[PDB]
């Protein structure tokens, strides 16, 4: 299929409380495999899947070292960004980063990821050319000039086009067992009666992987856009997902409404009504 290697990085200042909290979480096909948390009892990179215990202590010692170095660097960045925005020393602030590569079947780079946010707002991003940056405001222009003078695009390219791809292929090989598997949803409807003789029809999808899924409610062909209450896909916490979609219908009329469930583990969608 088309597969991704993404690192999600966070630094949060806590001045007067301690030093910043620093985190790196790695994903493969939007599934978490490694985690570093500076607030863990003994902070080191740790396996967060089964198939990563296949790596020896040198992998972990080396990724820890990198995380301990990135940590010190994000502390300086937090102080630098106070200056650029002329913010007081006393408040809590966040830098987040999405760093990653996605390849298709070719096994060559489709899309390079390096995007930053400050206190939850876009700050700077590598463009799709893997050469230029886009700044979200005045402060980010300062970072832009600094990064051009230093040739930071290139050093990041080398990793993105090189080391990122090569560790993606390796991680897929080691983990394909679980990554490219397909747990098909188990789906059912619940009828909860509601004031002024109406009924909530709730279409459940449970125990599915991957997360990607569509739920639809309809009455003879036509898909109910407006009326549909739709929760965010949630993890069961065993690597499978849950979702539900609901509609309000008049009593006596429940039987005319149909739910569809589309997922990669189904050649044709599931169809379900009440009872």
């Amino acid at each position: 299929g088309p597969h991704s290697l993404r690192y999600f990085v966070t630094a949060v200042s806590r001045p007067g409380l301690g030093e910043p909290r620093y985190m790196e979480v790695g994903y493969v096909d939007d599934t978490e495999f490694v985690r570093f948390d500076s607030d863990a009892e003994n902070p080191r990179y740790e396996p967060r899947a089964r198939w990563m215990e296949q790596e020896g202590p040198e992998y972990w010692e080396r990724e820890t070292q990198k995380a301990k170095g990135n940590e010190q660097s994000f502390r300086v960045d937090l102080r630098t960004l106070l200056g650029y925005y002329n913010q007081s020393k006393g408040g809590s602030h966040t830098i987040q980063v999405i760093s990653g590569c996605e390849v298709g079947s070719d096994g060559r780079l489709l899309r390079g990821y390096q995007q930053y946010a400050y206190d939850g707002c876009d700050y700077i991003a590598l463009n799709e050319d893997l050469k230029t940056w886009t700044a979200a405001d005045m402060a980010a222009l300062i970072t832009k000039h600094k990064w051009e003078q230093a040739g930071e695009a290139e050093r990041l390219r080398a990793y993105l086009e090189g080391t990122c791809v090569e560790w993606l292929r390796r991680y897929l090989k080691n983990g394909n067992a679980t990554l490219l598997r397909t747990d098909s949803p188990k789906a059912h409807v619940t009828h909860h009666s509601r004031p002024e003789d109406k009924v909530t029809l709730r279409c459940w999808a449970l125990g599915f992987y991957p997360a990607d899924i569509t739920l639809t409610w309809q009455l003879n062909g036509e898909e109910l856009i407006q009326d549909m209450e739709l929760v965010e896909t949630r993890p069961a916490g065993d690597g499978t997902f849950q979702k539900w979609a609901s509609v309000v219908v008049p009593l006596g009329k429940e039987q005319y409404y149909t739910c569809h469930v589309y997922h990669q583990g189904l050649p044709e969608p599931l169809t379900l009504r009440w009872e």
């Binding site: 990085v9 170095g69 660097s73 994000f74 960004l81 830098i95 930053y116 970072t143 990064w147 080391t163």
Partner: peptide, 9 residues
């Protein structure tokens, strides 16, 4: 493998 020594802002 994460990128290591992310560039200084």
């Amino acid at each position: 493998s994460v990128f290591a020594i992310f560039a200084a802002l």
